[PDB]
Write a protein that binds this DNA or RNA. Structure first.
Length: 194
DNA sequence: TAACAGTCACCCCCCAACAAC
DNA sequence: GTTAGTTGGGGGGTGACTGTTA
């Protein structure tokens, strides 16, 4: 809301060079990986004479003065309700990035998935053939079918979930022991269910 | 820290139900 | 009690990789 129209900080020298250089390198090397083009761009920035870098730096200093002006002008027009909604948006965006960074590290570290419930088991088996066009309609079908299962049929799902709670217990015991060996005791559970 | 960007390989959120903090 | 992560796919999104700077 407020954060969308908020003036944004200017781009520093190298990033300004990189933005202009990447389309040129991408034109001349269309099947190359961007990571590799960025590595060459950064080598070109390092070799660049200081008199050329200064040209970029001077524009940055001047863009920073425009920024101070825009950000003062913006903030001054804001009501306390706006400021407050701006600070919440910034907080939410920060929290969401922090949580995604923590999740990607757990995937990189090979963390075992949580146990699958008898219901998760049923969604896995039943989804493909469940009536519905879109995945949201098919899930509404599945959930209703789950509601109507006999004890006889529900037992199969209950037994698959029992096995997965054992796999979860085994996998966790060894992953936690490995996290300790790599010095990541912060990743371990505080509480474990009996 | 997070600004620029293309690609990869997930991640989150919706619809729903069902251990760890 | 509340949050987060799971089974399913698909829309819409982003951190890691490649870098430097303020």
């Amino acid at each position: 809301s407020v954060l969308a129209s908020c003036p944004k900080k200017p781009v520093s020298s190298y990033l300004r060079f990189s933005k202009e250089q990447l389309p040129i390198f991408k034109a001349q090397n269309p099947d190359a990986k961007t990571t590799e083009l960025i590595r060459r761009i950064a080598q070109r920035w390092r070799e660049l004479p200081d008199s050329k870098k200064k040209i970029y730096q001077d524009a940055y200093r001047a863009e920073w003065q425009v920024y101070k002006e825009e950000i003062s002008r913006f903030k001054e027009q804001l009501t306390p309700s706006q400021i407050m909604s701006l600070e919440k948006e910034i907080m939410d965006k920060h929290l969401k990035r922090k949580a995604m960074t923590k999740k990607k590290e757990l995937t990189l570290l090979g963390k075992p998935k949580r146990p699958r419930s008898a219901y998760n088991v049923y969604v896995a088996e039943r989804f493909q053939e469940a009536k519905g066009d879109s995945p949201q309609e098919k899930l509404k079908t599945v959930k209703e079918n789950w509601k109507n299962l006999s004890d006889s049929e529900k037992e199969l799902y209950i037994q698959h979930a029992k096995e997965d709670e054992t796999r979860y217990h085994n996998e966790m015991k060894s992953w936690e022991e490995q996290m300790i060996e790599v010095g990541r005791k912060d990743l371990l559970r505080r509480t474990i269910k009996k």
